[PDB]
């Protein structure tokens, strides 16, 4: 269970970064379309 905890936070941090990076590229891509 401690490994599961660390693996759960590890992937949660990568998913947060990718959701945030995507959020930014979504704004940039919408800007480039205009």
């Amino acid at each position: 269970w401690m490994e599961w905890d660390r693996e759960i936070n590890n992937y949660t941090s990568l998913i947060h970064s990718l959701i945030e990076e995507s959020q930014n590229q979504q704004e940039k891509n919408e800007q480039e379309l205009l």
Partner: protein
């Protein structure tokens, strides 16, 4: 390019979530083995 770039970002997000999905299933089967 930004679209292909965003697609990569989405795909990586899905793969990351897939790992999370596997981990929760492992958690569920572990708890189920002891409560069933």
């Amino acid at each position: 390019s930004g679209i292909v770039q965003q697609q990569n970002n989405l795909l990586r997000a899905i793969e990351a979530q897939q790992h999370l999905l596997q981990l929760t299933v492992w958690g569920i089967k572990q708890l189920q083995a002891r409560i069933l």
